[PDB]
Structures are given as C-alpha cells and as structure tokens.
C-alpha cells in the first residue's frame, strides 16, 4: 500500500539501513518518493524502495 | 354571580371593584402593581368563595392581608396553573400575612410566596392539609423566619384557640393571621370537609358547609357543581365545564369564542388531541385518523419563513394550502423549533423552496411531510427547490421517511455540504426519478465541499460505569495517514434509539450533542479511544465517532469516516437520595411518611427502604432550665460592604495540511533514485411502587429519624441508596401530660408555701416546664418551675405570700405543649 | 576552503568530516538521515562561517546541539531556498537546542524548525534581529513548551550574562542555549554588523568582526565579497556570482557549457531575449529570443518561493501553473521577482487554496494563458477557494488573452464579482462561461467594492422599532422586481464593517431582513425592523438582489429611549447609625444613557407585633448541563420574564403610637452607589432604586427595585439614659423606675432586672407593655434585707449595658 510520512522514511531506513541513501550531484544539470509511494494512486513498493538506497 | 374569564387588576384599588359581584372566578384573578389608594379597609370582596385557576399577586402596595381582600375565598382549584403554582405572592410590600383564613383545600399546584419582605404567618400554615404537594411550594425570601414572631390567636392571651399538627419535627399551632386560626376538621370526618361547628360535610363537598350532610350547603364542590348541588359527575343531561361546574348544551352553545365543543362529557374551547368537530361549526367531535387534519391556508400564495418566529403562524398544521419559501438565517435554536412549528405539516399543496437558508443542516424538522402536491409551481415547473444553502447536509432521513412529490421537478443548486448521493436518494423515494434533467442536478455546486463517502469506524470495545463510558474503535488510516488529524466523538443523552447525527447541529457552533476529541494515538499498537465522564447512571447515550480529515487531494479522494450510532446505557447505580421526605402523624403511635422519587432514578426503581429509629432527648433539653429567658429575636443590620473553537480546529487542520505538504517537499527533494442516652433499635420496611407509607406501633410524641433509601434492580449488589432523611415527630397522646394524681399543698416557715404534684406517666416528650398560677380569689400571680427544679425537689416553693383563701393551679409544659390545668388546690398562709 | 556547489552530508557522521576545512558553502548544506550516533559522534567545525543558499537538517540522530557542529556559522544568505526557508531543522532526535549562537544574520529566507521533540531553546531566539521576514517563520512543530522558559544564561549562572528583548509585545531574555546568549548590539549599530567587542563594524558588513572596525575582517559580507574585502557593488572588472561574491573572469570561465557574463552577473545561461555571442562565445548579446521553460510534470505546483524560483527569468512556460500559495506572507514580492517575466502560460492556470494571494498582480507581464491543456470541464483559468483573493489584475492597464478553455471562479469571498466579469471583458472570454462556472453566490461574498448607491429617503423610530425607506432603484435594464435586503446589527460603536464577513453566526452578526419593492410606484420601499432593543444603536444597510450593484451607506440609527429596566442586584449595608450605603448595578436594559438614578427611601414602622408580643412570655426553642437541567433553568427564566414584562410597563414619575412615614428622594448621577444620611437609628428603610435616563422628562424612571435595609444600631442609644430610681412598696416589695431611652434602636422589647442581696442571682423580666403602663416594674415579694439591682434594656438590636446599680433595702 502507500507510505507517506513518518512511515515512508522509516520504511526507507529499514530497506537501506546500512546501504545508505543516494545523493544527486548532477553537475549543475522527477516526481519523487513522496509521489511514487504516497501522493499518487501508484502505491509504494518494498521492491522499489531499493532504488532510493545507495549502491 | 360567576365571573371570568381571567380577571386582571393592574393599576389601582378602584379597579378591584370588578370583584364584588363575584362568588366564583372562572379564571386566575391577577392583581398587579397597585398603588396604595389610602382608602385603607375598603374594597373587601366577601362574596368570593372559589378561584378556579390561580391567584397571583405582584407589587400590590398597601395590602396588609389577603383576608381583607378575600375573607371567604375557600378553594383555589388550580385547573390552570401559573408555572405549576396556584397561589403566587411576589414582591408584595406591606403584606404582613397571607390571611386567607377560609382557604381550606387548594386542589392543584404549589404555593410560591417569594420576596415579600414583611410576610409572616407562612410557617404557621400547615399547607399539607391545604395542599397535596407541599414539596413544590418554593417559599423563598420573605421576612426571615427568625424575625416573624408568628404568634397565633390566643397565644399572647394564654388562651390558644387553634389546632396543632405535626410537620416533620415541628408541632405548633397553625394559623393564617394574628387573629384567625387555620380551620381543620375533626378526625371523624375522614377526608371530608366540615362546617364551622365541626359537623361533617357531604362526601361530595369541598372546603366548608353551611349545613352538614347536605349537597346544597357547600361553598365549594369536589368534582362538579350543578344548580347548587355538589355532584361526583355531571347528571347525564349536563356536561363538565371549566373543571368545576355542570352546564347544559344550551349553555355551551352560547359561550363566545367556532364555539365550544362537547367530548367525553366535558365542554372545551377546542376539541383535544386526536379529536375533530363533526363538521364545520358543530359541538360534537369524532376521533381522528392521524393528528387531526388542519388546513392552514394563507391569502399570500407563498408563505416566506425567514426567521424562527416567522413560521410561528403555522403553530401546528396538517395541510398547507399554499407554497413554502424557507429562508432561515441565524438563530441557533432552529431545527428544534422549526419542528415545533412545522413538523406536523403532512401535505404542502404548492411548492417548497429552501433559499439562502444558511442555518439549516437538515430539513428533518419537516418531520411528517408526506406529500408536496406541486399544484402550484415556481418557474420552469419546479416544485421542490433548494438554492444557496451554505450549510445544508441532509434533506431527510431516507432510511425512515417516504416523502413524495405529485407534480413538478426537483431542483438543487449551490449546496456545498449536501451530497449529490443524498439528493439522488431523495429523488429515489420522492417519486421524481425522471422529472428533472441535466442542469437541474448540476452536480458541480452540490456537495462541492462535502464528505460524501465514508468508511466505518467500527467500535472495537466498550466499557461502562455509573458515570463513565470508555470506548474504542478500529485503527483508521486514510491512504495518506497524515490527513487524519483527530477523531470527534459526539455523545448525547438519547432515551430512545431513533437519534441520528443531525438532531441539531445547525451551523451556530455548539449544538445539542456534547462532543470531545481524541488525537491519533502515538503508539501504533494502541487503539484510539475516549473516556467520556460526567455521564448519568442508567441513562442511554447515543455515541458516534467521525474522522476529522483534510481535503488536499479533492475530487472526493478524502474519505471522511463515520461510526455507526451506538446506543450505550451506562450502568445502573445506587439511586440518589429520595427527594423531599416529609411526614405528618395523624395519630400517636403512627406516622404518615411521604416522599418524592430520587432526583436521579439510577435504575428501574423497585422499592424504597423506610428505616425509622428513635432518637435521644436529653442532650439538648435535659439541662436547659427553660424557666429563664430565651434569646430575644434580635434583628440583623445590613452588612456586606463592597470546548475547542471552530477557528482553533481550522488552525489545527491548516497546520496539519502545511506540515503534510512540507513533508512531501522534504521527501521529494531529499530522496533521489539510484541511476438517659441509648441507641434505640432500628426498624426497616420495604414499600413497593408507593412513595408513602404509614409507620405504625410507635410511641407518643417520640422523635423518629426516618431514613429513606430508593432501590433498583441492583439493590442486592450495590445496596439501596444514600439515605435521605427527615426527623419525624409522632402526634402527642391526648391528656398524657395532665398530672395523673391529686396535687397537694404543704406549709413552710414564714409566709412561704410548698406545692407538690406527680410526674406524668408517659409524657409527650420531656416535661420541660411546670407553670403554677396562684392567688386569692384571682390567679393574680405567675410562677414556673424548670425540669431541673422538679428533678431536684418534686414540687416547688411559693415565696412570701399573704394570709387569705389562696388558690393555685399547675400546668405541665411538655415538648409537645401545655397539658390540661390541674384541678384547683386551696391553701392559706398563717398569721 | 570555499566549498560548492552544495553538500549532501548523508548517512555518515564519518561523512560529516567533509566540512573540516570549509568556511563558506557556495550552496545548500544538507545533514541527512545519519543514524550511527553512538558509533561516532565527536565532531566540531569552527571554520564554517557562511552558507549561501540554506541549511537543512533532517533526522540526524543523537545531535544534542548544532553548537557542537557549527559554533562560528555566522550568516545564511538564502540566495536559493528550500520551500521559503533558509534554515530547516526537521525530525531531529535529542536535539535539545539550536545552538547556532553566532548566526547573526539570515538573509532572504524564513526559518522552519519542526518535530524536533526535545528542542527546548526555540522560543528564546529573537529572530527579529536575525531576519526581516519573521512573519514567515514556522516553529510550530516544536517540543511542547511546558519546560523551556527562562533557561538562558540570564538565570543559569545565578544572575544574567545575557540580554533581553521584546517579541510581539512579550518580553524575555534572548539566548540560543546555555553558556551563550544572542549577539545583539546597541542602537548606534542598529543597521550595522556589530562586533564581539561591541564596536560598530564596517558599513558594508553583515556578520561579525573581532577587531572593532578592521575592514577586510568581516566574517560575512553584506552585498558582495571579493578578494578578502566586502564591496557594495562588484569592482569594474569583476562580476557577481552565486549571489554572494565577485569573481575575476577566470573562475566563471572554469565552472563545469560554462556560465555566461551579463548585466555584471554570472549565471548558467543568458536571460530571456539574449543569446551567447558569435566568436566571443562567452558573452550575451540581444537576439528577441523568448526563454521557454518546462518541467517533467506537465503541471508545476507553486506553493513556495522555490517552486516559483525554478522559473526565475523565464518568459514562456510549457505546462500548467497550479498556484498554491497557502501561507506565504508578503512573498508576492518574491513571486513577482521570479514569475513576473512569464508573458505566456501554455497550459491552464489554476489558483486553488492560494490564501496568501491578496492579488494575482504578481503575475507581472503575463499576457496569454493559451489553455493548450485544460482541466476536467475544459477549464483554462480555474480559481477555487482563494479566501483572500481581491484582484485578477485585469484593471485598466493590461489585457490578457485566453486562446482556448473556459473560466471558473468559486469560493473567492473577497473578490468583487465585477472583477470576474471585467476579466471576461478584458480577456475576450465572454463567449465561454456558464452561470455555473462564474457564480454570484460564492464570489463577491465579502469585502466587495461598490459603485452604485442607495439613499435613505426617510426614517422613523420608536422604543422597539425602526422604520426605514429608500429610493426605488432601477437601472435602464428594467429586469425584475429588485429585492432589497436590509441588514441590521447592534452597533455599540460606529466601527462596523458591511456584511464583509464569513461569520454566519456568533455573538453580534448582521441580521438580514429581506423586503420586496412594492408594485405601487409612489411608495418608497420600507422596512419595519422590529424586536430591536430600546436605545440600542443599529447599523442598517440596504442592498439589492438580481450586472448590478446598489448598496447603501451604513446608517447607525438609534431606537428611541424607553423606561429603564430595574437596577439589578441591589445590596445595602450600614457602617454608621443614621446612615446607609446602597449599591446596585446598571440595569439589565438601560434603555438610555443612565444620566441619573433616583433613590427613594422610606421608614418602615417597627413590626406591629413587637408592640403586642409581651416578650416576657414563655417560648420553647425546639431545634433538631443535560437537557433536564437546561429545561429547569429555562422554566425559571420564563418565570422571571413574565414579571419583568409586568413591571417594565410600570413607570415612576419623579417629583416636580406609630403608623406611617413620608418618602425621601435623591438624584444620584455619578455611579451605582450612594450614601443615604440623616436616617433614624436602627430603622428599616425601603430603598426604592429607580434607574432613570435622559428621556425621564417624557417617560419617567424605572419601577423600583427595592431593598429593605436596616440601619446599624447607635451604640449607647438604647441603654437607659439616666440613673435608676427605686421606691418601697406594700407587702415587702420594691418598685424600680427608669426612663425610656430617647431614641431606642428600633424599640425596647423588654427590660431585664438582675437583683440579689449580695449578687444578682435572681432575674426578672419586664415587657414593654407593662413598662409603658407603670414607668418601671414592681419587684414583688422580695425577701427582706439589703439588696442590689441592675437593669438592662433589650432593644430590637441587642442589649443595652447594665445600668448603674441601685442599692435598695426591704424592711422586715
Ligand atoms: C383538595 O381537593 C382534592 C379534590 O378536590 C383532593 O383530592 C385530590 O384531587 C386531585 C385533583 O386535582 C387528585 O389529583 C389527580 O387529578 C388528576 C386530574 O388532573 C387525575 O387525572 C388523577 O387521577 C388524580 O385524581 C388527587 O389524586 C386527589 N387526592 C386524593 C387523596 O383524593 C385533595 O386531596 C385535597 N387536598 C387536600 C390537602 O386534602
Ligand atoms: C540581515 O541581512 C539582510 C541582508 O542585507 C538585511 O535584509 C535586507 O537585505 C536587502 C538586500 O541586501 C537590503 O536591500 C535591505 O535593506 C535589507 N533590510 C533592511 C531592513 O535593511 C537585514 O536587514 C539584516 N538584518 C536582519 C535583522 O535581518
Ligand atoms: C460611613 O460611610 C459613609 C460612606 O462612605 C461615610 O460618609 C461619606 O462617604 C463619602 C463617600 O464614601 C465620602 O466622600 C465622605 O468623606 C464621607 N463623609 C465623611 C464625613 O468623611 C462616613 O464618613 C462613614 N462613617 C460614618 C461614621 O458615617
Ligand atoms: C353588580 O350587579 C348590580 C346589579 O345586581 C349592577 O348594578 C352592578 O353594576 C354590578 N357591578 C359589577 C362590578 O358587576
Ligand atoms: C408545467 O409544465 C407544463 C408542461 O410543460 C406547462 O404546460 C406548464 O405551464 C408548466 N407550469 C405549470 C405551473 O404547470
Ligand atoms: C416507505 O415505503 C417503503 C416501501 O414500501 C417501506 O419499506 C417503508 O417501511 C416505508 N416507510 C414508512 C415510514 O412508511
Ligand atoms: C424519537 O422518538 C422520541 C420519542 O418521543 C421523540 O421525542 C423524538 O423526537 C424522536 N426523534 C429523534 C430524532 O429522537
Ligand atoms: C456494567 O454493565 C455491564 C453489562 O454488560 C456489566 O458486564 C458490568 O459488570 C457492569 N459494570 C459495573 C461497574 O457495574
Ligand atoms: C392514619 O392514616 C392511615 C392511612 O393514611 C390509617 O390507616 C389510620 O387508621 C389513620 N389513623 C387514625 C388514628 O386515624
Ligand atoms: C425498566 O422499566 C421500563 C419501563 O417500565 C421497562 O420498559 C423495562 O423493560 C424495564 N427493564 C427492566 C430490566 O426491568
Ligand atoms: C583539509 O586539509 C588537509 C590538510 O591536512 C588537506 O589535505 C585537505 O585536502 C583539506 N580538505 C579536506 C576536505 O580534507
Ligand atoms: C584589517 O587588518 C588587515 C591585517 O592586519 C590590514 O591589512 C587592514 O589594513 C585592516 N583594515 C583596516 C581598515 O585597517
Ligand atoms: C470598535 O471600538 C471599540 C472601542 O472600545 C472596540 O472595543 C471594538 O472591539 C471595536 N470593534 C471593531 C470591529 O473594531
Ligand atoms: C449619551 O452618551 C454618549 C456617550 O456615551 C454621548 O455621546 C451622548 O451625547 C449622550 N446622549 C444623551 C442624550 O445623553
């Protein structure tokens, strides 16, 4: 189902709890997690929260 | 002659003179605001014998006594009452006493006598033999009882002429005014009236008689009066009228008013609930099918209802032969009073428009509206038409009501809080499934800001106590858990299981329901719940829960949840004290004890435990030395110098919405995808379905503490009740205080003498005094002996008399009063 | 080192070490999601001085102060922002204080600090001396404030090492944490950077200085920094870059397409209308090429200055603007700075829940809303639930065009409906809208502007009524029987609005009585407003019903005066014999200016039974909210109201051995208290208080609210006024004779005579009835011998002191 607030970051930390979270560093040049997992009807995924872990 | 209706004297004594041709008043007889006329003892009305409804006196200056106004007023029947009062005496300056010395039997109501600053002879009246319901009296204010004196006629003369009767602990002479006693019939005339010379009235009489056992000699009748004869019920040729008399149909046809009607043997201004006249103006009535069909036509085709009182001319109705235009804004009592004025409207022949009615959350106040005929229609064939109602949420409880529109289309526009599902359900039951189309039901402006779909907040557990309900419900989390900001629990006392949410709730803030909020519990394992407290035992409460939610997504993706309305009866409890225990002893060794049901019946009242125990006398009386001055009635001089608001809840909702959106910005910007004292025995008795009992086999003039406990079906578990109590006094035994033996005199040295008498065998309480009157050929001298002096010496000394044919008499004063004077004793002093 | 373009300190306190020798962050600084507290935490970074964009801390574990990390962070310049905020501290655990004690300025950005459950120093920082826009801060999600007062060094070291200031109108010490207080400076540096030595530093300075005025030692520069010195504008051969510093060209030429130079500033690309020059491929040169901008989501929601700032300098926006400014106080000036150059919106414009927008005019230079995508319902300009919106621009200075799509306007209470129709006039969208799309009901509901006028033609007044008439208004479009609504409300003062409020109910809210224009053309429309209280001032304004107009001015008409209600809650006391104090309240209904209260008083005679009782007789001295509550109180209320209805129709016309006494009267005008003097001692007086008003000359005063007040007894006035005298009498008896007190307290009810041969063992009672018959009393049949006696008068108030003893003798 959907994970939005405290739940979304808690789930993300449980998914990546030592792998860490990624960072952009885009060189000066996109709906986001709160949309793919919460705001849209898309719903969250334990198999997609892995995409926001650093690896 | 008989007078009425509703005599009202309002400015001056000259207006009183309306009364002197009146012997019975078929009305109240107010006397108000009269200025003192300085005619003094003028304006007596001795003809008046009966007031049928209620005597009300207010601000009547210079009236020192009502016995000067109505010396022969015998009965105030109380057929109509002044807010449950039959005699009202309010702010009556200069009124020294009520003085209605012939008022015998007030048939109904209570006696409020309020703030009459000089009023005495209130406590001297034993209203328990004038009134059935003394507990309702409300004798508040007046002259303070400590300052009244209240001396009965003959008391200051040492020749008391009045009767005595017990009111609880108190036993003293009963009087209406300084010169006149309260007239009480002897015990032989059981529940009858009597003439002045003690002879019993006819059984159907009331108050007093000119001659005994005569129906024609009555000054007042119980039941009914006809041609001078008091009658239990009207002779078959006549009909009951104004609660007191029998009049023929030839009389009831002639009263100005459609005229008076005759039904169930009585004649009335209008035929009562469930009955209607035979046809047009006619005297006889028939039972009605429902509430009696009344047409409510108005010369204006469309009756506007724009304020709560604007509907008042409906007043109770069945068939409105015109059109309605409800327009109610503001007032905060709206639905509970719109239903009073319009709930009985079964049929509206025209159209019904509800326009700009921002106060209404529900049209359920039109309770019995079965048909809107739509014979007349507004425009474009509209017959039911609501427009621009900022707070309408419900039309009717369609689970219960079967409204129908014969002709014309339904129309709804700009109703932010009323759901299109609710208007569709209206059209599904009103017989209007295909009249209107498209723009009539636009759906753009109806329910635009309404919670039209709800999940169910299932109650998971309930727990109750005498004053508590602890209740919990299933863990609710909308798709976005953030937007559930709180739960609102609405609870109200609901004796019957028909209460829906909109029993009130009209948009003025607070409403009929009490309500309290529960935050979402921080611990995800804990279920939400509330402890409602301050509740009443055994009372049934309607309790239901609603989820307070944001609207951020819109497009009806908000899902504001509701619980089902749960009717929870709090536990039965120990009943409160049984109200207003009051007692009167009709005989020695017996005590009639009456009371009223407890303030809170905390369960189905099964019985009352009445518990009488004797009380010791000595610890107040036995050392008092009563043959010494009491404290004088000194007067006091004047002394004494010099729930959360809707705005708050909107603030909480807005802050929660802003927190939600900023958390979304947090996450979508931060996260990136990887690319003599003794205790006497108790006595107990159980009385079932009767708020009075006759305690028997008691002692003469003995103080019994009477505890009373109400009981319900929980009595075995919780005990009965906290005792309400009254200190009741048994009536004294006649002659028990007169000295049981011959008094003797004996000599003493010098000019003094001694007298001796035996103590009474069974005195009516402690004999607190013995009075001795002595003198030669005249009882010229007084003396009195305390209880202590007798317990010392037996008799008492008379000091320094003179030789002569001296005589003496003795009188015991017990706690009940003085007994009979002893036979005279003759004695002389030696030279 | 100066570090950029932005730092994500993430997942590791060991990665927090990346700041060991940074001093100025040319970007944001993120401290995010570090969980390994007890494994590492030891870090401090004295070198940090400036953050150019913003500081964000999110779920950093075990950080008990930012005074550990950044003791010398001095300025946050906010050139790029995080949802209006330059400082964000969010969901931190065990935070316990902010601790940025040297952060003397935060430029162009609010502060939000939320859900840091242990934060206990948030309210003690005087943000008024840190940032200008304190109105935009969001500290709301703080730790509950039940534990965080007066913890500053102003108290902690037993006495202040601190200073105090005012916020709003409350007054408190200012500190960031213990051991540190906020670095303010005197008013002589009130627009200058202050110093640790409390001298005013350089004029072009922003942060702090160690030396008193040693320029080139400003820890943070105001305006722009360059080569170690501050400057108000960059030197003539240096260019502004990243909103904080000047650079010589060889830096902006070495940022990995390279940054352009234009208008003396260095940015990612030339602004709208400019293109990079030929064969000098660094400089910008004018074409007029419009700078098109876009987003991956075809709808850009604008809730914050950041979401608008993604379009800074754009001219054509490919996509839909969902303008959503819910709380952005004064940020319309920033929205203008960013979006006031978008001439064309290709998609729809949706202004929904944008309560911060008083006006849409921040969309400067906006010219077209093409509607190449439209909302459900084919709308291209959709305006919903904007509580404060007053203008869609479209005044007589600039014309919009909506190529395709319909307009929608709902729940814009403060927006004059004339403006939404003028928008149809200006934009040419007359052919699109339905009456369901543009509503006269929920638009213009409040704060409406007005041009048409209704005049009060005549008025009439009575105690409970106002009668009002106005002109028969009608335009050249003789459409309908125009319905005139009279709005009447109690106006205690003339500071009254129109019905420009959402207060459907509560206390005093404008009541509305609708009226219809009568068919008879001669009669001016009128209303008999009724139920009005006497003398209350009622604002009345007429209005018209269905483009239209016709409001009247507010008339603060006053109902005529009436006889006042009873003066409530009368009470009385007596500090002194021959005087009474009487006190009351202003009446329940004054029904006028309480110009004066009449007070009348009259002697009540001593109770007649007192002359009859013969008080020396015997007596016995026998002793020993739910619906139901609301209904009982309502029944009592009706009972009181019937008698008020009785006596409020009663009016009093003011003055142009014992039986009865005359009345006495006073006008008291000052206050609800009076002193009544020259009274009889211990006498009961009926104090008839008659509330009165200015129209007494025509209507009279109120019927009396009486109180029966007893004067206090005059001490030494009921003891016998002279020496007792005695006589021998026949049959071994004595007579005692004594005068009656001249002015006894009420009455003399009895005299006690204490008598005895050596001590007054025996007691005799003399009633008033016997005393007035014999001038005394016969002590009958006393034993012969030497004797003593004393006499005590018992008045209505108490005992008189036992008289001087009489030593009579009885002879054997
Ligand atoms: C005063 O006189 C009345 C009769 O005139 C004595 O009897 C009481 O009469 C009242 C009638 O007001 C009875 O109350 C109830 O009346 C209603 C009609 O409103 C009726 O529906 C009830 O069934 C009931 O009759 C009351 O029961 C009755 N009481 C007795 C003991 O007979 C009344 O006792 C007299 N007062 C005194 C202090 O003696
Ligand atoms: C903090 O520094 C800022 C930056 O100078 C001051 O805010 C405004 O900054 C702009 C741009 O430099 C100036 O044009 C304004 O004049 C500044 N405001 C004022 C009131 O002068 C700000 O004043 C400084 N102090 C505080 C307490 O915020
Ligand atoms: C008793 O109280 C009254 C009322 O306070 C005193 O009389 C006057 O009261 C007014 C208003 O308080 C003062 O302004 C006057 O100064 C008072 N009179 C005097 C002479 O001071 C009165 O003084 C008090 N005492 C007695 C013995 O009457
Ligand atoms: C009373 O009756 C007499 C005739 O019996 C009549 O003259 C008089 O006007 C009447 N008075 C009142 C007050 O009815
Ligand atoms: C109702 O509809 C009918 C048929 O369209 C039409 O003749 C009539 O005028 C309408 N109005 C009324 C009041 O009947
Ligand atoms: C209304 O009619 C329906 C259908 O016959 C029936 O189920 C329901 O009980 C009716 N309600 C009333 C109040 O008559
Ligand atoms: C329910 O029935 C009771 C019984 O008299 C009635 O008073 C009440 O008006 C009915 N309706 C509701 C909603 O309680
Ligand atoms: C209240 O009533 C319930 C009925 O189910 C019972 O189980 C419970 O024991 C009662 N509690 C008390 C305190 O009487
Ligand atoms: C007292 O009253 C009761 C009933 O109220 C009656 O049974 C009893 O006989 C009465 N006693 C006397 C002595 O009248
Ligand atoms: C309580 O009394 C009411 C009314 O008499 C009755 O309907 C109900 O069944 C009773 N319940 C019990 C448990 O006695
Ligand atoms: C900090 O200083 C050291 C010198 O010991 C240097 O090697 C390093 O590059 C500097 N910067 C960082 C981020 O360590
Ligand atoms: C600031 O200090 C530096 C270093 O000593 C010095 O070069 C400079 O002249 C000083 N500034 C001023 C204004 O004196
Ligand atoms: C009007 O002025 C009075 C002055 O006392 C004030 O109390 C009141 O709040 C003001 N009302 C408004 C709406 O400003
Ligand atoms: C009533 O009092 C107000 C001040 O509250 C004053 O302006 C006005 O002139 C007064 N009017 C009269 C008739 O006393």
Residue numbers in the entry:
A (entry chain C): 4 to 32, 39 to 64
B (entry chain A): 1 to 257, 264 to 648, 675 to 707, 741 to 896
C (entry chain B): 1 to 256, 264 to 294, 297 to 555, 564 to 641, 676 to 707, 741 to 896
Authors' own words:
The insulin/IGF system regulates cell metabolism, proliferation, and differentiation in vertebrates. It consists of three peptide hormones: insulin, IGF-1, and IGF-2, as well as their membrane receptors, including two isoforms of insulin receptor (IR-A and IR-B) and IGF-1 receptor (IGF1R), all belonging to the receptor tyrosine kinase (RTK) family. We identified five viruses belonging to Iridoviridae family possessing VILPs with ∼30–50 % sequence homology to human insulin and IGF-1.
To determine whether the altered effect of scMFRV-VILP on human IGF1R signaling was reflected in a structural change of the receptor complex, we performed cryo-electron microscopy of IGF1Rzip, a human IGF1R ectodomain construct, in the presence of varying stoichiometric ratios of scMFRV-VILP and human IGF-1. Reconstructions were readily interpretable from the initial model stage in each case. With a 4-fold excess of scMFRV-VILP (calculated per receptor αβ monomer), two major conformations were observed: an open-leg and a closed-leg as previously described for human IGF-2 bound structures. For the closed-leg conformation, a 3.06 Å structure consisting of the intact ectodomain and a single bound scMFRV-VILP molecule was determined. The structure of IGF1Rzip-scMFRV-VILP was observed to be analogous to previous structures of human IGF-1 and IGF-2 bound to IGF1R. As previously, the overall receptor conformation is seen to be an asymmetric Γ shape. One molecule of scMFRV-VILP is observed engaging the receptor via the primary binding site L1-CR + αCT' module, relocated to the top of the Γ from its position abutting FnIII-2′ in the apo conformation. This relocation is accommodated by hinging around the L2 domain relative to the FnIII domains, resulting in the membrane-proximal FnIII-3 domains coming together, forming the bottom of the Γ together with the remaining L1′-CR' + αCT module. Only one ligand is observed binding to the receptor, as for IGF-1. As for all liganded IGF1R structures, the scMFRV-VILP C-loop is threaded through by the αCT' helix. The C-domain is largely disordered, though the density corresponding to Tyr29 is still present.
